[PDB]
Design a protein around this ligand. Structure first.
Ligand SMILES: CC(=O)N[C@@H]1[C@@H](O)[C@H](O)[C@@H](CO)O[C@H]1O
Ligand SMILES: CC(=O)N[C@@H]1[C@@H](O)[C@H](O)[C@@H](CO)O[C@H]1O
Ligand SMILES: CC(=O)N[C@@H]1[C@@H](O)[C@H](O)[C@@H](CO)O[C@H]1O
Lengths: 165, 165
């Protein structure tokens, strides 16, 4: 069975393993070279203003030159996306489902996703009847019990609002 | 068909989607809460000196307190792992298959993994017959054509050294 990439239903490889053009995880030219779909591709995948605004897979940083990677060259000055070293403001959605904290910064973890979380992958944003009709952000689904999320548990049976199925 | 985690061959979800305790991708308490395996867990997965050296999945930063996330609270002062904002020295292999550049910093992309790459996910590191019996770093496999890597193409048939067959 395929492991990753379009052959593997969009899954990523663990530990920055490259997803080959054939949808398997590994390192070396056969995986990280021509056709590499994700992970530590070499060269790095094209991103940002050099890929129609597509972000790097695996939370890699998008360099000023529009290549995916890590290190000061990628995350530092000129960084376009991913975990840049610069604080990322929001209010305006965060990229890649990052939580917009009550303070208006993007991140993950309770400080961002917990109390006061405005959008993105909030821990427990209420919605639906339980929240008097409140809507979810990010086009998430409101589950049966009145929490915002994605996946079958929220978009499937009982789904109240959002892109239910 | 499981998607992720221990049920899904250790696969990650894309775009920070949480892998539920049951091996499916999504957001909300069912995925990100109790039992969350990877992605934007809430709270963040335990990591670092507080979790037996475990690194964060999906290249999340490990906070001073040993939780996985993004933002200055996680990647900034006291960051233990992942794409911390501080340059990351190596010589001490880089965590999670990051390339140790010729200059002794961890990263991904050609500047790190290309010419002069010492270890990690180097673009092209020769080995075996084709390189005078030179061994691969990181316990990678030496392919039949004398390139260092992982996955079937390197660890399968023709494998010269490392965790072959
Ligand atoms: C939870 C949160 O949003 N914390 C942010 C922090 O990430 C950011 O670095 C700082 C910028 O001054 O503002 C804090 O409030
Ligand atoms: C490819 C490489 O290692 N580049 C490093 C850079 O990541 C680091 O931030 C800088 C610190 O002075 O030194 C450079 O040589
Ligand atoms: C370069 C490539 O994708 N080749 C794959 C390899 O990655 C995978 O590990 C193997 C199954 O074990 O099947 C090969 O065809």
């Amino acid at each position: 069975a395929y492991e990753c990439g379009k052959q593997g239903g969009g899954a990523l490889c663990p530990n920055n393993k490259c997803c080959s053009r054939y949808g398997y995880c590994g390192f070396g030219p056969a995986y990280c070279g021509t056709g590499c779909q994700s992970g530590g591709c070499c060269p790095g995948k094209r991103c940002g203003d050099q890929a129609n605004g597509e972000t790097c897979p695996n939370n890699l940083c998008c360099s000023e030159d529009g290549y995916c990677g890590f290190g000061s060259e990628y995350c530092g000055a000129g960084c376009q996306g991913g975990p840049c070293r610069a604080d990322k403001l929001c209010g305006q959605l965060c990229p890649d489902n990052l939580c917009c904290s009550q303070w208006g910064f993007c991140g993950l973890g309770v400080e961002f996703c917990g109390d006061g979380c405005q959008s993105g992958a909030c821990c427990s944003m209420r919605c639906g009847r339980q929240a008097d009709g409140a809507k979810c952000t990010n086009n998430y689904c409101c589950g049966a019990s009145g929490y915002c999320g994605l996946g079958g548990d929220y978009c499937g049976a009982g789904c109240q609002s959002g892109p239910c199925t």
